[PDB]
Amino acid sequence: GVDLGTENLYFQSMMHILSIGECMAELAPADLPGTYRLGFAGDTFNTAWYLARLRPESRISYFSAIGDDALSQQMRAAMSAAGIDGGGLRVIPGRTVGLYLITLRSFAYWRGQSAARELAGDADALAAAMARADVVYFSGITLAILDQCGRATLLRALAQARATGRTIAFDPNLRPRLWAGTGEMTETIMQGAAVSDIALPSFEDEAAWFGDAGPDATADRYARAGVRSVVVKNGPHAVHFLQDGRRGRVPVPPVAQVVDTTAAGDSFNAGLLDSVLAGQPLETAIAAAAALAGQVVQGKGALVEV
Amino acid sequence: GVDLGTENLYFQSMMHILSIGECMAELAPADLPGTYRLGFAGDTFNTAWYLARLRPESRISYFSAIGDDALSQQMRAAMSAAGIDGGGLRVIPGRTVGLYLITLRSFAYWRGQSAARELAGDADALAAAMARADVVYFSGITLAILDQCGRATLLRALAQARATGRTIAFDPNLRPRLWAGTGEMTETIMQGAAVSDIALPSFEDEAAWFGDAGPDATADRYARAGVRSVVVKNGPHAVHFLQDGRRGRVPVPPVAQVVDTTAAGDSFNAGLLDSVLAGQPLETAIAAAAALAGQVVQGKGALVEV
Ligand SMILES: Nc1ncnc2c1ncn2[C@@H]1O[C@H](COP(=O)(O)OP(=O)(O)O)[C@@H](O)[C@H]1O
Ligand SMILES: Nc1ncnc2c1ncn2[C@@H]1O[C@H](COP(=O)(O)OP(=O)(O)O)[C@@H](O)[C@H]1O
Ligand SMILES: [Cl-]
Numbered sequence: 226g227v228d229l230g231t232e233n234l235y236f237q238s239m240m241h242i243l244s245i246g247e248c249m250a251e252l253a254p255a256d257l258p259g260t261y262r263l264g265f266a267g268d269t270f271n272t273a274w275y276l277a278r279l280r281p282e283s284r285i286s287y288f289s290a291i292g293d294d295a296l297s298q299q300m301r302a303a304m305s306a307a308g309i310d311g312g313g314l315r316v317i318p319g320r321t322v323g324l325y326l327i328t329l330r331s332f333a334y335w336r337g338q339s340a341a342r343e344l345a346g347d348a349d350a351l352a353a354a355m356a357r358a359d360v361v362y363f364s365g366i367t368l369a370i371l372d373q374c375g376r377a378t379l380l381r382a383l384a385q386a387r388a389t390g391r392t393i394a395f396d397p398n399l400r401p402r403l404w405a406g407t408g409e410m411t412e413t414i415m416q417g418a419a420v421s422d423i424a425l426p427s428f429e430d431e432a433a434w435f436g437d438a439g440p441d442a443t444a445d446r447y448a449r450a451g452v453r454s455v456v457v458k459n460g461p462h463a464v465h466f467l468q469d470g471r472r473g474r475v476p477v478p479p480v481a482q483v484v485d486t487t488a489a490g491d492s493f494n495a496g497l498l499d500s501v502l503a504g505q506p507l508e509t510a511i512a513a514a515a516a517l518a519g520q521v522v523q524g525k526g527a528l529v530e531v
Numbered sequence: 532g533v534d535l536g537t538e539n540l541y542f543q544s545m546m547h548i549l550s551i552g553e554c555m556a557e558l559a560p561a562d563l564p565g566t567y568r569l570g571f572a573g574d575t576f577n578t579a580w581y582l583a584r585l586r587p588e589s590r591i592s593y594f595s596a597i598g599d600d601a602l603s604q605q606m607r608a609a610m611s612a613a614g615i616d617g618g619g620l621r622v623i624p625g626r627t628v629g630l631y632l633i634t635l636r637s638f639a640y641w642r643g644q645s646a647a648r649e650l651a652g653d654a655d656a657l658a659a660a661m662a663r664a665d666v667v668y669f670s671g672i673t674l675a676i677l678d679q680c681g682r683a684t685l686l687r688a689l690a691q692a693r694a695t696g697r698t699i700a701f702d703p704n705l706r707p708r709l710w711a712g713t714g715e716m717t718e719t720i721m722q723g724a725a726v727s728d729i730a731l732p733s734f735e736d737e738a739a740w741f742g743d744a745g746p747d748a749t750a751d752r753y754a755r756a757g758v759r760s761v762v763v764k765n766g767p768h769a770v771h772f773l774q775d776g777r778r779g780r781v782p783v784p785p786v787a788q789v790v791d792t793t794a795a796g797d798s799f800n801a802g803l804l805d806s807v808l809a810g811q812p813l814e815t816a817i818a819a820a821a822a823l824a825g826q827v828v829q830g831k832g833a834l835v836e837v
């Protein structure tokens with residue numbers, strides 16, 4: 226029941242963003258002790274979720290793979306209820322979705338066999354999902370969960386879409402545990418950068434694994450891979466950017482009552498991409514992104530109503 | 532805080548049963564929709580759980596492997612609270628436990644990377660756990676989750692303990708999804724039978740995968756592997772047994788209001804082993820086992836208070 230709007234050969238009635246990655250089932254403590262509430266999250270899904278609330282008149286699509294069990298159907302229903310277009314979701318007969326459990330907060334997860342790890346199994350389906358997207362967004366988690374072949378399939382699809390005028394956006398989102406080794410991680414992340422117009426790295430993660438001395442070194446590294454607009458998040462600190470050789474800095478207004486940094490980066494990315502799609506200048510988009518993330522860290526959970 | 536009693540060189544103050552396998556975190560629907568209650572289950576653990584309630588003066592030990600996270604510590608606390616001796620539990624630094632989710636009932640599970648899959652990594656620790664056990668109990672699930680090397684380690688430990696006067700009990704508990712193929716499953720199950728004094732197969736499962744024509748064919752197959760007492764469960768039907776060439780049948784009194792067959796076999800096994808350890812004749816032990824399982828299928832969940 227998500228409105229997809231109309232189209233002719235040349236234009237679609239809705240601006241269209243596609244987000245590609247893994248959505249996770251999540252269980253978080255409910256009020257009665259020993260009980261947990263079931264919901265859905267996951268980095269790229271979270272960004273799609275914030276996007277659907279920022280621009281509910283637009284088309285926000287999610288591309289992934291899920292199972293055919295009850296939990297997978299619950300997940301599909303959740304996306305629709307969030308105003309997210311899940312029409313491109315692939316179903317993998319023998320598998321189920323990934324899950325994480327928050328304990329009371331500690332995170333445990335199970336995703337090694339998730340259906341989403343096959344999301345790049347069908348090159349045609351990937352290409353069709355991107356074809357008329359204004360922006361295609363993916364993360365280093367999207368890359369991490371795929372095998373060698375799937376990664377190549379995804380990067381080729383991204384590169385071809387980029388060449389037809391899709392704007393490609395990438396959050397490195399470094400999570401070493403999801404990679405076989407950090408050598409593989411850093412190498413593959415930079416392959417992702419090589420197909421992206423916009424990159425949204427977070428500095429402290431980059432500094433740990435790449436050895437970046439500062440946010441400007443981070444930007445330079447991405448710009449070296451051909452990224453046109455690099456926006457470097459850095460916690461409570463100013464956001465440095467680099468766009469076509471031009472550097473800039475955008476302040477991040479102090480937030481008191483920081484509660485939970487969950488989805489800080491995911492919501493930043495949504496606020497940023499929302500504003501870029503509206504045709505606002507990068508400095509303005511970064512300011513908007515920081516404002517949204519500022520509210521998000523003041524709320525509990527990955528999906529905060531703002 | 533579980534009482535282990537005392538011992539001298541020759542006897543221990545408590546009868547001692549060891550159960551070896553995987554305990555699972557489980558989430559089942561709570562009263563408020565969208566919420567689930569966290570508990571712990573898993574076939575061999577369930578049997579240990581019923582055993583601790585049948586003979587709370589005895590020592591009921593559980594041997595497995597868990598992680599070092601909060602969920603693993605919750606599981607360890609649960610065993611202790613159930614009066615189960617978890618002193619032999621091994622901790623695997625980088626892993627967590629397996630989980631299953633009941634949806635509202637459909638079962639989804641995540642166990643491919645669970646710490647319990649390493650429970651046979653330390654041959655010394657296995658041997659020490661069995662050393663003064665009166666009965667050692669394991670299942671085909673215990674075998675399924677181990678790799679080739681772990682399986683060999685477990686079977687050697689079981690065979691050596693059997694030779695020193697441990698009574699070895701085995702429930703084939705056939706779950707094809709946990710095996711690479713059904714050829715591997717049937718072969719390995721019969722290796723388990725080859726080290727067992729008592730086998731507790733369920734007929735309909737055996738008929739599907741082995742091709743057994745009837746419960747007597749099932750018993751014969753196990754007796755051929757050297758099993759001394761084969762007790763064949765068969766749903767609501769009479770229990771056939773075979774002990775040292777002697778056949779027998781024990782009736783299963785009709786149960787009305789069957790609600791949930793979860794742990795029917797696990798509780799049967801507990802009622803049976805409890806009665807064997809008390810020195811009761813096999814026919815009497817089977818009658819007791821059927822009575823307990825009869826109550827268990829009249830209650831919700833794997834762990835029913837009887
Ligand atoms: N301590 C903080 N105070 C205020 N804003 C923050 C804070 N941490 C993060 N943010 C906002 O969220 C954005 C993303 O920060 P980052 O730490 O990279 O996200 P994550 O924690 O998801 O990795 C920042 O640009 C900032 O706007
Ligand atoms: N429909 C039933 N009515 C009465 N007792 C039952 C029924 N199903 C199982 N039981 C009891 O539980 C025991 C185990 O049966 P089984 O079906 O092998 O367990 P499971 O369902 O766990 O495989 C039986 O011997 C019987 O005593
Ligand atoms: Cl048209």
Ligand SMILES: [Cl-]
Pocket residue numbers: 538539540
């Ligand atoms: Cl002594």
